[model samples]
Target: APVRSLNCTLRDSQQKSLVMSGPYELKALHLQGQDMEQQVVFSMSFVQGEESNDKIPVALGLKEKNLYLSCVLKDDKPTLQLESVDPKNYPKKKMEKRFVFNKIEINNKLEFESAQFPNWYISTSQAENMPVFLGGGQDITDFTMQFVS
Candidate 1:
């Protein structure tokens, strides 16, 4: 799969900017100590462009639909490479950083607190228990792909 396009947007507050969009296949999906009943999803989009405001799409993992989104800010903060799903221990509520995979058991979840990309979450499962399928919510708006064969 190949990235199609990139959409960039600047934040109105604090002069901070974050970009997200993805069309790359993900390498792996990790989850920790959470039930399969929860909805799990993630995304990737444009973050920033120092050269110009024009949206430029950056491609990562050529054959993979998983992508990397960068967050541009006034200060140099850590870029969110890939974040793991957070487990929502509570019921009927969404946890900010949580992941649950019933097929596999995970205890430690990766945290990308410094990442500012708006669409940085990625779907880890196609299971009905996953929420990425609900509401047609999963998408890679700024990228495209082609078949080599």
Candidate 2:
């Protein structure tokens, strides 16, 4: 990954994009004709250099917003949050590491797995309109990703 100027989306087989609703909950929604606001895209870039680890550390954020897709603990349950982070510290402090994820690519798809929580992934809900959660069943684990040029 060259960390090119890329903005992308997580789509389902039905061509649905992961959309945020009014913590910024997300669900797969394909509003046929007018999905302007529903068109969710993320600016994707790498954190650690490629081949530096078994998995690639990636940072995902809304196209122009400062918020990032992050995993955190709430009520002691690992949860996904659109959190704000500043990469001020580096080398070993690992301050902004929580905002990064290991994009697990399997079956030609991507899985947003938290480095802090082993085996925990950002999974989608099969139940329509339901928010995506961390670590769940089969359908929840895999997600289709695409770039919008």
Candidate 3:
């Protein structure tokens, strides 16, 4: 599907409201992942400039550093980590630093699954509105994100 401007709302596991900041835009890109197959990845950024082409990459920043949604091997099991540094400046092999979605089924709602951890879904915390991952067995509404037109 063709990519377009969207307003992403991050919510919590209990289907509670979280971050409602911007009508961020989504950009799609093709990349190769662990399967060595062409994978569709998306990058989100707040709208900037007068033209639609201009955008600033959204980084989960805190204090003096940027937080990255990354996948790494821990105890021989795939795990997700929110690293406090830009992935571009770190060693690539240490962490599969990419926000690749396992799936994106846009119906009445937007849904995303972690590429590395297929059983994990993306969600946010109620208090801080911080992003968190929940296991698959939980309620689907917990991970049902919204994209306002």
Clashes of each: 34, 0, 0
Candidate 1, residues 1-149, lDDT tens digits: the string is 23233222211112211222233222222222452212113222222222223322332221222322222332443222433222232111221222211111123222122223433432223322222210115331121121132
Q: After superposition, how far is residue 103 of candidate 2 from its true place, in Å?
A: 1.2
Model 2 lDDT tens row, 1-89: 23444678776544556877845666666556676557678877666633343367777777777667778888998888777555332
> Tens digits of per-residue lDDT for model 3 on 78-146?
654555555455322222324444434444344545555655555443433243443352243233444
Flag the better candidate by lDDT, 2 or 3.
Answer: 2
How do the predictions measure up, each by TM-score?
0.17, 0.78, 0.41
Backbone clashes, candidate 2: 0
Ranking by lDDT: 2, 3, 1
Better of 1 and 3 by lDDT: 3
For model 1, the local distance difference test gives 0.24
Worst lDDT run of 10 residues, candidate 2, spans 86-95
**Candidate number with the higher lDDT (1 or 2):** 2
Which candidate ranks first by TM-score, i.e. highest?
2
